[PDB]
Amino acid sequence: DLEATLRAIVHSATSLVDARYGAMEVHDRQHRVLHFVYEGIDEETVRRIGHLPKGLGVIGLLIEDPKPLRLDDVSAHPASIGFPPYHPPMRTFLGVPVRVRDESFGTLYLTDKTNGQPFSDDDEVLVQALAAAAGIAVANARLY
Amino acid sequence: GAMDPDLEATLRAIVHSATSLVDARYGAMEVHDRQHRVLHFVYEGIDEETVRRIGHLPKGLGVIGLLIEDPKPLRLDDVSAHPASIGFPPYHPPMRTFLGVPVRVRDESFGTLYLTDKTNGQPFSDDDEVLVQALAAAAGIAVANARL
Numbered sequence A: 001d002l003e004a005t006l007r008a009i010v011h012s013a014t015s016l017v018d019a020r021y022g023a024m025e026v027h028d029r030q031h032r033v034l035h036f037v038y039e040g041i042d043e044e045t046v047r048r049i050g051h052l053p054k055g056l057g058v059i060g061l062l063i064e065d066p067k068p069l070r071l072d073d074v075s076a077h078p079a080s081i082g083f084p085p086y087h088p089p090m091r092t093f094l095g096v097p098v099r100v101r102d103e104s105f106g107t108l109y110l111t112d113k114t115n116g117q118p119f120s121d122d123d124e125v126l127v128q129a130l131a132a133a134a135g136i137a138v139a140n141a142r143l144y
Numbered sequence B: 001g002a003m004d005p006d007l008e009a010t011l012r013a014i015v016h017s018a019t020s021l022v023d024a025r026y027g028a029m030e031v032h033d034r035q036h037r038v039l040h041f042v043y044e045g046i047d048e049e050t051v052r053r054i055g056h057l058p059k060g061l062g063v064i065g066l067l068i069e070d071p072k073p074l075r076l077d078d079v080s081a082h083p084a085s086i087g088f089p090p091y092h093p094p095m096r097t098f099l100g101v102p103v104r105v106r107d108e109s110f111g112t113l114y115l116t117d118k119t120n121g122q123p124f125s126d127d128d129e130v131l132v133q134a135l136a137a138a139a140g141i142a143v144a145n146a147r148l
């Protein structure tokens, strides 16, 4: 199961960096969402928010132009679309592409590092390393 | 022959992250087949001249052979003092502190991720072990899904 694998990767990222929230989106070449896995938000809150992300705002930027991005305040970025009603507040941000050499498929991202600090150089390196493993997983599912 | 390019980049990045974050002087990973024969070995922290002097890659013996045989996390204050120790070959850096963990999925283990010589002179911490285990699990995912 691909989503179980992607969830394991999100868990490792969130726990090791010590972020409150973690997520991964995988999309097709038209930018349609194929998979969205996440941790940090209870299902009651999920039910209030409603539909899962479509890959807009800051995530849209990263889908169009895959490369690592860290932000002190996600809502301050020019590409920021804003959260939907009932979504938890989130401030600090780290996002990296989920990719292989040939192609990028998705984005692994974290918000709200514990105790309020920005994501570090070391956090970005770690998250890139985990994402690469997810990149291989996604590339394999696309063949198999 | 050579490892799949994406797999190799991923494993090397994982070794680097593990080595960097636990502040190890040296880091390595061996990957083996189902019969436990070593196929690939990637490493960092040893200069290229010392590599030429050592002259042959590890076969998976000593304390590593133990981890290959019995895939479990293993921390040691002095790797050379372990009764499984085979000893380092000529020209190989002396290495004292050791942290090694299986590269695996639920059903099968594929290899070992290992770090030596913490910069602080101290043994690898419990925190160090947890971080390396998670990185090894991602390496396990990579190996399992790697391009045929």
Ligand code: HEM
Pocket (backbone or CB within 6 Å): A021, A022, A023, A038, A039, A040, A041, A045, A046, A047, A049, A050, A051, A052, A053, A054, A055, A056, A057, A058, A059, A074, A075, A079, A080, A081, A082, A083, A084, A087, A090, A093, A109, A110, A111
């Ligand atoms: C738990 C991990 C999550 C993280 C780290 C996260 C993070 C984000 C980020 C960074 C944005 C872009 C904000 C902006 O551009 O201003 C966003 C937008 C959004 N999020 Fe969340 N989110 C998470 C979970 C969820 C969940 C579970 C839902 C739905 C139940 C959700 C629904 C949305 C929607 C609808 C948007 C608007 C843009 C879009 O549709 O892509 N998010 N989120």
Ligand code: HEM
Pocket (backbone or CB within 6 Å): B026, B027, B028, B043, B044, B045, B046, B051, B052, B054, B055, B056, B057, B058, B059, B060, B061, B062, B063, B064, B079, B080, B084, B085, B086, B087, B088, B089, B092, B095, B098, B114, B115, B116
């Ligand atoms: C740079 C990261 C490295 C680490 C962390 C590392 C670690 C180790 C450890 C823990 C042992 C077992 C010691 C014992 O059981 O007494 C060992 C043995 C050995 N190492 Fe290294 N090593 C590294 C690099 C290298 C390189 C680059 C070479 C060759 C160019 C090499 C060649 C060997 C050989 C030949 C053995 C003897 C046992 C065997 O053949 O498996 N090592 N190493």
